[PDB]
């Protein structure tokens, strides 16, 4: 079986570099080249280059040339892509893929990495403040505000309360922190005879809060 | 570099539909294009190749055709799971190039969104921001405009939106705003309002409250 | 030294193809694969293509279509060895098919012919170690 397993996630300040890596098995490495494309958030797929292991030549897109450089090391066949003079456009998940080849016809990207996050951010890494969003049907949430980097995971009553929760993509703020609300619609006969708590968890930073939301 | 121009950018269709989804280049690349599936949080998938070859393994509803410059996907027979994000590339020299996707999505009757509007917390006031919260739940289809008044002045500039992914169960949409204003500024207005215009509503739904 | 299915001749590695392709097809294949169309620059080499190839028509890396004739990897072809056919190259227009002829083949005798670019000829990829 094929597999291409790229490194961690990774938040990088402007101007610093980036690499990433990405290690191939199941297949003979110098045969295919390895390419590398990344897909900024909500955004299309970008090529950005291309290297061949058995003779370490490289293809670079004009945009990242001087910029992007492409490694290959046959001997744990990973393939690297290092990403220099970051800023904030480069914030991606970063593939690398092989290019397959049936004989004679034509090229295609068959085995994909599973994708690396890159995110270019002179912010630091905090934990969120949650404020409670208050109320035949109520609506109720928390607002999860000023935290890095991304994921935050919110549950409702200890995960018990699913139905009708709603918890939307982080918005990027101009502070460079992320901001995000999760919501749930429950019956207006209901707040008085259940406590509703929403359980807020950011691991990079450890922050655990459990903000009771009240009419 | 070649242009992939992918038509159309979005589409909603239902299990069961036919699905064909072009896309046109700059020039001449003979059979040399493959098409890409892509879930949330997931590298592509290789669907079809040289233009018209099922990938290993892919599912026969899959089919592509044409050569040159005008290539089409077709999904013959659309399955719940192949709602997705679908990209043509082509591989003609340097630099290979996408198209810019179409987005699949569920189609649905329309359903007006349930507003609901949220004052800043006592709470966050007290560190000096104030965050007003607009709710727009289950609604389809997508398109929606919220437009947030703070004493009948239309704002515009402090506002970011974000937008659920389809349901998996009743397949609609739900939308958040969030109006920034500073504490100073919150505290100089009394009403603030939220205007919800979607198809589900024969007029705007404004949904407001008076700090206080 | 030389990939799976690819077979080494000089220091160099030749990949001899099954099937058909316009010209700008197979230089396109033999450059995603880290190669070219064959240069051949010596009858050593053309001797071995040869041998490969059999009495088909196959694509080389040599095409008119910047003006004078080159060969794909820039090594001059005035300079350079050439085994045309006898009055060859001679741009033909009778084909039916549009235009002149632009691309140089292996014919069934080892000796070059330029052809239409758009026929579907085999081809020979070539990469140097
Ligand atoms: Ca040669
Ligand atoms: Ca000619
Ligand atoms: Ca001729």
Redesign the interface.
């Known amino acids: 079986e094929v597999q291409l397993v790229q490194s961690g996630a990774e938040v990088k300040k402007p101007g610093s570099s980036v690499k990433v890596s990405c290690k191939a098995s199941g297949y003979t490495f110098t045969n295919y080249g390895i390419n590398w494309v990344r897909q900024a958030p909500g955004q299309g797929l970008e090529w950005m280059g291309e290297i061949f292991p058995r003779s370490d030549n490289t293809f670079y897109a004009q945009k990242f040339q001087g910029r992007v450089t492409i490694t290959a090391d046959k001997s744990t066949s990973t393939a690297y892509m290092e990403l220099s003079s970051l800023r904030s456009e480069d914030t991606a998940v970063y593939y690398c893929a092989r290019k397959g080849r049936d004989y004679g016809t034509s090229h295609y990207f068959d085995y994909w990495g599973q994708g690396t996050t890159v995110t270019v951010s002179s912010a630091s890494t905090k934990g969120p403040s949650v404020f409670p969003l208050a109320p035949g049907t109520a609506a109720l949430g928390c607002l999860v505000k000023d935290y890095f980097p991304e994921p935050v995971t919110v549950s409702w009553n200890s995960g018990a309360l699913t139905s009708g929760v709603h918890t939307f993509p982080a918005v990027l703020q101009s502070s460079g922190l992320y901001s995000l609300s999760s919501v749930v619609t429950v019956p207006s006969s209901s707040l008085g005879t259940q406590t509703y708590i929403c359980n807020v968890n950011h691991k990079p930073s450890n922050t655990k809060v459990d903000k009771k939301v009240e009419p | 570099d070649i242009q992939m121009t992918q038509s159309p950018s979005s589409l909603s269709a239902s299990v069961g539909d036919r699905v064909t989804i072009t896309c046109r280049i700059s020039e001449n690349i003979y059979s040399n294009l493959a098409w890409y599936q892509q879930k949330p949080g997931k590298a592509p998938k290789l669907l079809i190749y040289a233009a018209i070859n099922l990938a290993d393994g892919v599912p026969s509803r899959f089919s592509g055709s044409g050569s040159g410059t005008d290539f089409t996907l077709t999904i013959s027979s659309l399955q719940p799971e192949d709602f997705a994000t679908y990209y043509c590339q082509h591989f003609w020299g340097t630099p290979f190039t996408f198209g810019q996707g179409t987005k699949l999505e569920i189609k649905r009757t329309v359903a007006a969104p349930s507003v609901f509007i949220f004052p800043p917390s006592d709470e966050q006031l007290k560190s000096g921001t104030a965050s007003v919260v607009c709710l727009l739940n289950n609604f389809y289809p997508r398109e929606a405009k919220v437009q947030w008044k703070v004493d009948n002045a239309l704002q515009s500039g402090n506002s970011q939106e974000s937008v659920t992914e389809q349901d998996s169960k009743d397949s609609t949409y739900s939308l958040s705003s969030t109006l920034t204003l500073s504490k100073a500024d919150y505290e100089k207005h009394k009403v603030y309002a939220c205007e919800v215009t979607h198809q589900g509503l024969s007029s705007p739904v404004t949904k407001s409250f008076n700090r206080g | 030294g030389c ?3 690819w077979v080494e001749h000089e220091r160099s590695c030749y990949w001899f ?3 058909g ?2 010209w ?2 197979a230089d ?2 033999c ?4 190669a070219h169309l064959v240069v051949v620059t010596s009858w050593e080499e053309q001797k071995f293509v040869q041998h490969h190839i059999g009495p088909v028509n196959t694509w080389m890396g040599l095409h008119d279509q910047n003006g004078p004739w080159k060969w794909v990897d820039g090594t001059d072809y005035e300079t350079g060895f050439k085994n045309w056919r006898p009055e060859q190259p001679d741009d033909w227009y009778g084909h039916g098919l549009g235009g002149g002829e632009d691309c140089a083949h292996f014919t069934d005798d080892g000796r070059w012919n330029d052809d239409v670019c758009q026929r579907p000829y085999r081809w020979v990829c070539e ?1 140097e170690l």
């Open positions: 990939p799976v299915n193809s099954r099937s392709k316009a700008a097809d396109n294949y450059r995603l694969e880290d990469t």
